[PDB]
Write an enzyme that holds these catalytic residues in place. Structure first.
Site, PDB file in Angstrom:
ATOM      1  CB  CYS A  14      -0.942   0.053   1.234  1.00  0.00           C
ATOM      2  SG  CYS A  14      -2.141   1.383   1.355  1.00  0.00           S
ATOM      3  CB  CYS A  18      -4.884   3.412   7.960  1.00  0.00           C
ATOM      4  SG  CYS A  18      -5.171   3.784   6.209  1.00  0.00           S
ATOM      5  CB  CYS A  21      -3.853  -1.363   8.282  1.00  0.00           C
ATOM      6  SG  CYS A  21      -4.114  -2.187   6.693  1.00  0.00           S
TER       7      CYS A  21
HETATM    8  C1  LIG Z   1      -7.788  -2.765   4.332  1.00  0.00           C
HETATM    9  S1  LIG Z   1      -8.506  -1.816   3.193  1.00  0.00           S
HETATM   10  C2  LIG Z   1      -7.674  -2.038   1.788  1.00  0.00           C
HETATM   11  C3  LIG Z   1      -8.390  -1.537   0.545  1.00  0.00           C
HETATM   12  C4  LIG Z   1      -8.167  -0.064   0.204  1.00  0.00           C
HETATM   13  N1  LIG Z   1      -6.759   0.218   0.347  1.00  0.00           N
HETATM   14  C5  LIG Z   1      -9.029   0.878   1.005  1.00  0.00           C
HETATM   15  O1  LIG Z   1      -8.629   1.429   1.949  1.00  0.00           O
HETATM   16  O2  LIG Z   1     -10.162   1.078   0.660  1.00  0.00           O
HETATM   17  C6  LIG Z   1     -10.099  -2.278   3.004  1.00  0.00           C
HETATM   18  C7  LIG Z   1     -11.095  -1.675   3.999  1.00  0.00           C
HETATM   19  O3  LIG Z   1     -10.900  -2.146   5.332  1.00  0.00           O
HETATM   20  C8  LIG Z   1     -10.916  -1.037   6.230  1.00  0.00           C
HETATM   21  N2  LIG Z   1     -10.110  -1.354   7.431  1.00  0.00           N
HETATM   22  C9  LIG Z   1      -8.786  -1.423   7.531  1.00  0.00           C
HETATM   23  N3  LIG Z   1      -8.413  -1.748   8.782  1.00  0.00           N
HETATM   24  C10 LIG Z   1      -9.518  -1.903   9.508  1.00  0.00           C
HETATM   25  C11 LIG Z   1      -9.836  -2.248  10.906  1.00  0.00           C
HETATM   26  N4  LIG Z   1      -8.857  -2.506  11.787  1.00  0.00           N
HETATM   27  N5  LIG Z   1     -11.131  -2.300  11.259  1.00  0.00           N
HETATM   28  C12 LIG Z   1     -12.102  -2.051  10.372  1.00  0.00           C
HETATM   29  N6  LIG Z   1     -11.887  -1.732   9.092  1.00  0.00           N
HETATM   30  C13 LIG Z   1     -10.637  -1.642   8.611  1.00  0.00           C
HETATM   31  C14 LIG Z   1     -10.389   0.124   5.414  1.00  0.00           C
HETATM   32  O4  LIG Z   1     -10.807   1.382   5.913  1.00  0.00           O
HETATM   33  C15 LIG Z   1     -10.989  -0.163   4.061  1.00  0.00           C
HETATM   34  O5  LIG Z   1     -12.287   0.394   3.944  1.00  0.00           O
HETATM   35  S1  SF4 Z   2      -6.310   0.494   5.069  1.00  0.00           S
HETATM   36 FE1  SF4 Z   2      -4.594  -0.765   5.224  1.00  0.00          FE
HETATM   37  S2  SF4 Z   2      -4.603  -0.913   3.089  1.00  0.00           S
HETATM   38 FE2  SF4 Z   2      -6.334   0.343   2.939  1.00  0.00          FE
HETATM   39  S3  SF4 Z   2      -5.095   2.087   2.837  1.00  0.00           S
HETATM   40 FE3  SF4 Z   2      -5.099   2.254   4.965  1.00  0.00          FE
HETATM   41  S4  SF4 Z   2      -3.379   0.986   5.042  1.00  0.00           S
HETATM   42 FE4  SF4 Z   2      -3.385   0.816   2.915  1.00  0.00          FE
END
Ligand SMILES: C[S@@+](CC[C@H](N)C(=O)[O-])C[C@H]1O[C@@H](n2cnc3c(N)ncnc32)[C@H](O)[C@@H]1O
Ligand code: SF4
Ligand SMILES: Nc1ccn([C@@H]2O[C@H](COP(=O)(O)OP(=O)(O)OP(=O)(O)O)[C@@H](O)[C@H]2O)c(=O)n1
Ligand SMILES: [Cl-]
Length: 280
Positions: A14, A18, A21
């Site tokens: 990525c 965040c 994540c």
């Molecule tokens: C991991 S991301 C990856 C896909 C893409 N990069 C995005 O952010 O949309 C997919 C979704 O999972 C959410 N997400 C990530 N970590 C999370 C957590 N610990 N609890 C709940 N949702 C989470 C993100 O906000 C995103 O909407």
């Molecule tokens: S959530 Fe995990 S994956 Fe989706 S953007 Fe933030 S960091 Fe990259």
């Protein structure tokens, strides 16, 4: 277990960081386009009607992504092809070229207060600009627009109704921060989401303020732990609730791999996992 809805996290890389994540950059490994297409064919033959592209950032590889969305729609004739992205690396020409094969494009935005997007780590404070631009592109080329939101300790008091009343996504996923063992549960993992966690009451503070929207889909922890079909970067099945991992479907097949994971079909339908996911 009919795998009617599958998330293929084809990459773990990525361009953002965040803090919460739950799908971290453990590997840079990525499947080959022949193997991925074969895996998507295997899941089609097992009953999958909706594919969702996810992982790290799918639009780190828009050539690989676009190849698979045209494949899933033209060749496998999947009902629903959907993408979840952080939006920053999306180019307008890619949306225009692949609009016919994409049913839904989902963009993530956890706050409309850009300072909190910096505190979270999703960028340097432009996520709302990214967000609205993605939605502008979706309505141009007639893709269903969807918004994903993570409710943390920093934004559960936030009133989002002015922006939701403006964007009007057809689908609005509202996740409570999820602690996944081995992904973000300590300081030995690539992320420490413990500072973002909220209680069932703090989550309900945000939910009651926004549930009146038709798009609103509340996803507390109990509805997120095992309601998903998670496909690894090797096309293995992940049981994030039980911290287990299967062999790749490319070797052992779909139905034999599915038997090793737990998938709460009851929570899958409670969260409205099956819905009108097609058209344009
Ligand atoms: C991991 S991301 C990856 C896909 C893409 N990069 C995005 O952010 O949309 C997919 C979704 O999972 C959410 N997400 C990530 N970590 C999370 C957590 N610990 N609890 C709940 N949702 C989470 C993100 O906000 C995103 O909407
Ligand atoms: S959530 Fe995990 S994956 Fe989706 S953007 Fe933030 S960091 Fe990259
Ligand atoms: N324990 C969990 C629960 C969810 N997710 C991931 O969280 C992401 C966001 O979910 P969403 O965008 O709602 O997934 P969809 O399958 O597109 O949901 P729907 O079909 O209902 O729109 C998904 O990629 C899912 O794989 C995860 O990694 N681990
Ligand atoms: Cl829409």
């Amino acid at each position: 277990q009919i795998p009617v809805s599958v998330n293929y996290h084809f990459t773990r890389k990525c361009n953002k960081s965040c803090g919460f994540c739950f799908h971290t950059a453990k590997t840079s490994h990525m499947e080959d386009i022949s193997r991925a297409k074969r895996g998507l064919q295997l899941l089609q033959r097992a009953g999958m009607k909706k594919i969702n592209f996810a992982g790290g950032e799918p639009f780190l590889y828009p050539k690989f992504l676009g190849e698979l969305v045209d494949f899933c729609k033209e060749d496998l004739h999947l009902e629903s092809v959907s993408i979840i992205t952080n939006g920053s690396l999306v180019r307008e020409e890619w949306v225009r070229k692949h609009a016919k094969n994409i049913d839904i494009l989902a963009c993530s935005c956890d706050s409309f207060d850009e300072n909190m997007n910096i505190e979270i780590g999703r960028g340097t404070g432009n996520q709302v600009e990214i967000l609205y631009r993605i939605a502008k592109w979706c309505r141009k080329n007639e893709i269903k627009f969807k918004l994903n939101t993570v409710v943390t300790r920093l934004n559960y008091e936030e009133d989002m109704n002015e922006h939701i009343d403006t964007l009007q996504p057809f689908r609005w996923k509202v996740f409570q921060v999820l602690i996944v063992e081995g992904e973000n549960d300590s300081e030995k993992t690539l992320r420490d989401a413990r500072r973002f966690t909220i209680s069932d009451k703090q989550f309900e503070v945000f939910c009651s303020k926004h549930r009146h929207h038709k798009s609103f889909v509340a996803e507390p922890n109990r509805l997120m732990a095992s309601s998903y079909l998670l496909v690894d970067e090797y096309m293995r099945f992940i049981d994030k609730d039980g911290n287990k991992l299967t062999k790749s479907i490319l070797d052992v097949g779909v139905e034999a791999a599915m038997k090793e994971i737990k998938w709460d079909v009851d929570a899958f339908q409670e969260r409205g996992g099956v819905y009108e996911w097609t058209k344009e």
